[model samples]
Target: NNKAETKSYKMDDGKTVDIPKDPKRIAVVAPTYAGGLKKLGANIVAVNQQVDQSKVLKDKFKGVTKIGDGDVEKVAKEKPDLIIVYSTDKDIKKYQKVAPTVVVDYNKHKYLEQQEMLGKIVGKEDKVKAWKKDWEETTAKDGKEIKKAIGQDATVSLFDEFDKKLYTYGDNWGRGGEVLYQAFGLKMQPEQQKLTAKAGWAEVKQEEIEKYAGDYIVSTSEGKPTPGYESTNMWKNLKATKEGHIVKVDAGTYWYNDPYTLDFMRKDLKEKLIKAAK
Candidate 1:
């Protein structure tokens, strides 16, 4: 017999719902939830198969079941006591039938806000607070060192090549945009700043790269660069590219914004910036 333990929880959507106080089996439809909950030591039973399969994540979820993309039946089979999904998912009603569901919209909130909300849902507020304190202290030190190495005025550009498009990011956008532009105090080009302020990201053609290029450029590729990008005159002409101020990052790791990914990116950014400054 299961001991009845439930609490009224306020979701990000401003709705009050009851969820298990200590869910033993959690089903996550969003990869961000999977990453965050796993870091908080939640008992995750099911996750979307499309999540990052980097060594760090793969090993942790090796025993967990992989569910199809938004498949309610697949997740229900795991018998999860709670289900966490993104607000953008289309099958919210279907997921609710499987268990108590909570919505988290990462795009609408900064990384720290998302962490706090997720922590509250899963009863890990103390752990979340502790982690936030440590992360802030560490990033503060790293950011100060990075700013010293590369002058405070040094601009940094972040772009990712995905589905044959070049996408630039804003401060809250994933791919370490928050860390580079906000935490490290790097400057963004005026045009890019304007575009990214409203839309989290902007797509640019090869010819328009200069409008967004900075003193240092950080690029991530989904797999390979769009065909002939390396040979394009626009690509080769950027000052950062010419001066070897470009740092290539692992797209798998950079694409997600969670505690695990943030930790990895913080270290990665520190190393890349130090090397580039040298």
Candidate 2:
């Protein structure tokens, strides 16, 4: 059995780890990368309750056991060969006691880097790299089209409201931040970039919307109109808002940055941006 069934994988943060040569059963607690892993055909046998919010994965993860992060007993019963948890998860040690659990800092890597890392972790490096190449190429084509319509000078903004808190996000956050900022090369305020650099997002106030709002605005909701701000003068008089240069994406869908998520967002956002520009 000396097939060297366990090999090493390196993360973007430079942390190297050994994972199964082929992980057949993976238990994921990090909802962020779950889509990528599953879409890449990683044998994800189980996931946590947090997986429910990702709309992009609705058709995915079928028949996968759902357990809460705190449900160590269920995870133990599932017999996953590997367990991937967020760095912020409180039960890393507990999960490790059950399997080869690895801690993942959600914000430690950019979205693409995160996917690449996940691909390496479960023995899907080539497939993930394949997706990356196609993704980059397609985005470059779409990005050029988008840039032609919106112009390089126009700035885009990413805004989302979570549990009553309004936030402005940069590259890492899944709410079109990756597509607009990283892939499309659209511009955002350098000031906003500074704010979101560390945490991926910066909290903002309604009264201060002008400071972060951009020429084309992309905000998300589960599937409803965002409340309160629609009526606020500070929110209404905005150039993007007044000119209908805005898009409200699905909150659940925009919550992820996997290939499926990015692809869907790419098409949805690209068409919307081009139309809004027109």
Candidate 3:
């Protein structure tokens, strides 16, 4: 799968030139970075525990020595020239000392910003461009399809149902909510729709399900079903449920905030929304 020719880049320290064609040893400190690394066809020798290699990255790399919760010592022992870290990790400061670390904010619409930074670091500009082009084309196609199926005026609600409660995504949360608002152009329900003001998440009473009643409701979770919860009861009564307008999202990708995982999310969410609209 690796076809790119080798290119060398000047390091920030100004003493070395690293080749992106093949970095024999690499460590990804953030789970988010794995998708991008896999894209470049770079071999990763070590990775932090949070990295979920199940879907896109499944069994692609070998011999990933565990580096203990993104700690500096374990990463230093791995002796990797490149280390990918996200700003969300608390141990980022320490990891910076261990290797050449690139910090990224995974929870933003600007995920490609992180990809571009990584591309420069690894000397894989061509590959990055290809990926970006593919992303743009796919995004545009998916948007067109969604609008066609659901109509441009379709109202959609993105939420999670778990433990007898409903958690709606605010505008700032990057994954489902952002995709709905920015890409799909859905209007978000306000804070008053929240059933509990005290909780970062709110409860949606069974009768009040209409408050969040949209043309479609996207539900995300780790797939745990709680017993006797009000949301559980509400799930039965929801109009979307009766109309088959309620969709269950794969939480592993939709809610997983890793650097390399956005591409998976883009594809998965588009497929889900399209299917839901039908």
Candidate 4:
């Protein structure tokens, strides 16, 4: 009986479970954690269908098992040493029957914190620590360059259309809000700041789109916008839209808050903002 071979992985809600010192063949039932886990060198054996949403991950997990989310039989058959899932997932007990399952409260930690935690789970602590140190400088440089071009007082908005409604995000929500607001120190429209503070995001009335519009808009969609979005007077009348300050991102590329996605957003965003700058 040696404790060195396994360590306690703690959850945000103050629970702990023992996991392997090195988890090879990790089956991640949680889509949010898999891409970062793979980047941190976890031997990912099986992942959910959502992993294929990103171009990088689509190519990254090509030969890996593409079992859709929460398929207990497929997860069990892979013989994973460890399994990770969202705390809210409906199949907790089933996943635990097959492996050392750890429940993650997805909203409990920011992406940097999540990556560091995953590094611990995979025996790659130093990799994440090294990443943090390097990234602090990387983001600061890019942030300065971006602010200089876009104007110090300019506010940015994160817009998305889904289920026949328009919504916006907070600092930790997806759609590059983290890179734009948290890492880069950009301001959000006062309306959005008050809105996202409590809910992290909120649906907006389509007729009042201009009320929430900022100096710059980064709208994310799955190859389309709300029906007739391009022809609407509200869309055309927004300050950001009229001034050519909008950046449209595909949902596939901008869906997660993981390191790969954030890095892509950082670069994807900086380039666009610079090009759009007067």
RMSD of 3: 5.8
Q: TM per model?
A: 0.89, 0.85, 0.71, 0.90
Q: Itemize residue pairs with steric clashes in candidate 3.
A: 32-258, 32-259, 32-260
Clashes of 4: 0
Worst 10 residues of 3 by lDDT: 11-20
- Cα lDDT tens digits, model 1, 79-133, are 8899988889889888888788887776666677778878888788989999988
The list of candidate 4 runs beyond 4 A from truth reads: 1-4, 171-173, 197-200, 223-229
Q: Write the per-residue lDDT of candidate 2 for residues 120-219, one digit (tens) a residue.
A: 6777788988989988888878888898998877888887776566678754455777887778778886557667355547777877787788898887
Residue 68 of model 3 has an lDDT of 57
Report the CA-based lDDT of candidate 4 relative to the real structure: 0.78
The alpha-carbon deviation from the true structure for residue 194 of candidate 3, after best TM-score superposition, in angstroms, is 12
Kindly give the stretch of ten consecutive residues in candidate 2 with the minimal lDDT sum: 221-230
Compared with the true structure, all predictions reach lDDT values of 0.78, 0.77, 0.61, 0.78
> Each prediction's Cα RMSD?
2.3, 3.2, 5.8, 2.6
TM-score quality measure for candidate 2 = 0.85
Superposition TM-score, candidate 4 onto the true structure? 0.90
Better of 1 and 2 by TM-score: 1
